[PDB]
Copies of this chain bind each other. A is one copy, B any other.
């Protein structure tokens, strides 16, 4: 299969990169194209749905891209597209049900004390999108996001659907052989990504939703961290060494980054996202990694902050959740706190390929332009200078 990965970026209106330092399609363009092409199925797992302005209780014109998606979704079911939805149990889903689109609500708080934080699509079981969208107009053009669309990638979409079908069964924890995966950290798929060979595998975040042969998202994340020999670049929304009531400590990712930077000298870059809903206990635990630097080992930590839009609930964050090394890629939907790897649902794509060009270097060039952005500040920037609620910093 002639698999092509495109990294597709949701960029907030008014947020831009002046050098065109990585230009690639919008999540809206990718989604509208996926819908317009769709003819058999649109497996779509989301945390919530908030596409319409009225479903937000807002009246912003930028809802239109989501409402177009909604309009197009309203065309999909009478066109015969077998739209099915899994959504976290808390109007648009009733409009879809009236259009004939199936909806199931997942009581993740009953099952495992968490949420269905995954955002992905699987289209004709040939294409897929996986990433930090949120199935709302805000995710499309109000919050910065990264995801991978893998066109013509039928063998990999047909395994991301294995992640969806679990949540679809929950919204109706055992897993039956149907959910198992052969293509994991130990034996990824061989894919001819843009014509250059690559090894690729998909992971799931809470061990109850990892079937046999699925790599746990923490295992894949820690392994990508421990196999690196030159650099580890991470962009993730939230990072906490906790199971975030009563206090627990979660060293698991902290130890992988300490070990890797010390034993192997690996350059570690952590790019973590700040907004008014960021837990303040992050700051001490980020400073506890940034102190491993002078001599001898090098971890550096930076704060991504997306700058009238403040009137919108949950707008203006960088929701992104990926990592890249000299050797591997990791695109995910889980945030980096112990609950996201134990209690909450999440997924990630990992792709390794060698040489220049290709996905790994496109993702690295994305990380580099993020990290060099004005939108990435140091872990001690003056809070008012950050142009947003620097609640953590």
B288 touching A294, Cβ below 8 Å: no
* B287 and A263 within 8 A (CB): no
A286 to B, closest residue via Cβ: B291
Question: Which residues of the partner chain B approach A297 to less than 8 Å between Cβ atoms?
Answer: 284
The verdict on A251 contacting B251 (CB below 8 Å), with A242-B262, A280-B295, A281-B295 known, is: yes
CB distance from A287 to the nearest CB of B (A): 4
CB distance from A110 to the nearest CB of B (A): 26
A249 within 8 A of B: yes
Cβ contacts under 8 Å, A296 to chain B: 247, 281, 284
| 7 chain-A/chain-B pairs, Cβ below 8 angstroms | A247-B263, A248-B263, A251-B255, A251-B259, A281-B294, A284-B291, A284-B296
> Known interface pairs A242-B262, A255-B251, A263-B247. Does A284 touch B280 (Cβ–Cβ under 8 Å)?
no
Report the Cα distance A291→B289, complex, angstroms: 9
- Is A312 close to B, CB under 8 A? no
The answer to whether A251 and B258 touch across the interface, beta carbons within 8 angstroms, is yes
Residue A293 at the B interface, CB < 8 A? yes
Question: Is A292 on the interface with B (CB-CB < 8 A)?
Answer: yes
Scoring A residues 307 to 349 as 1 if CB is less than 8 Å from chain B, else 0, what string do you get?
Answer: 0000000000000000000000000000000000000000000
Q: Which residues of B contact A280 (CB under 8 A)?
A: 294-295
CA distance A189 to B281 in the complex (A): 42
Chain A 370-393 per-residue mask, 1 if CB under 8 angstroms from chain B, else 0: 000000000000000000000000
Cross-chain contact B247 with A262 (CB below 8 angstroms): yes
Instruction: Give the residues from 258 to 300 in chain A that come closer than 8 angstroms, CB to CB, to chain B.
Output: 258-259, 262-264, 280-281, 283-285, 287-289, 291-297
Please give, as numbers and ranges, the residues of chain B lying within 8 Å of A285 by CB-CB distance: 291-292
Distance (Å) between the CB of A357 and the closest chain B CB? Answer: 34
**Central interface residue in A255, A288, A289, by most chain B CB within 10 Å:** A288
- Which A residues between 52 and 73 are near B, CB-CB below 8 angstroms? none
A249-B259 in contact given A291-B288, A297-B284 (Cβ < 8 Å): yes
